[PDB]
Amino acid sequence: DGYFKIYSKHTPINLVRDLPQGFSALEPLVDLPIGINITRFQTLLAL
Amino acid sequence: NKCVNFNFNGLTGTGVLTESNKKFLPFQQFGRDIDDTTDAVRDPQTLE
Numbered sequence: 001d002g003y004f005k006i007y008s009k010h011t012p013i014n015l016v017r018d019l020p021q022g023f024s025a026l027e028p029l030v031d032l033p034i035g036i037n038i039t040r041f042q043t044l045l046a047l
Numbered sequence: 048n049k050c051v052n053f054n055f056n057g058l059t060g061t062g063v064l065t066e067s068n069k070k071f072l073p074f075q076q077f078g079r080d081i082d083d084t085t086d087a088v089r090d091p092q093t094l095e
């Protein structure tokens with residue numbers, strides 16, 4: 001509907017090389033009214 | 048605690064309004080029952 005919606009969660013953990021084997025809910029942190037076409041995306045690392 | 052025609056945001060319906068004990072999450076606006084009828088609602092003006 002032209003809202004780019006972000007759902008998220010934080011938990012502290014203790015793992016070395018796996019995605020945590022379990023279940024949790026993500027809350028809507030924002031619902032940005034942006035209306036654009038998207039096909040691809042990229043993520044930003046500190047250097 | 049008296050029967051009233053409630054309306055929040057166009058939700059006309061008749062009932063006793065009562066103060067809830069429900070812990071709705073921060074983003075959360077209407078409560079629906081098991082029956083999918085609305086049975087709780089955040090007030091738009093004041094945080095209850």
Ligand SMILES: *[C@@H]1O[C@H](CO)[C@@H](O)[C@H](O)[C@H]1NC(C)=O
Pocket residue numbers: 037038039
């Ligand atoms: C988004 O762009 C692609 C590639 O140009 C196109 O195939 C797609 O139809 C566009 N999205 C919409 C909603 O038309």
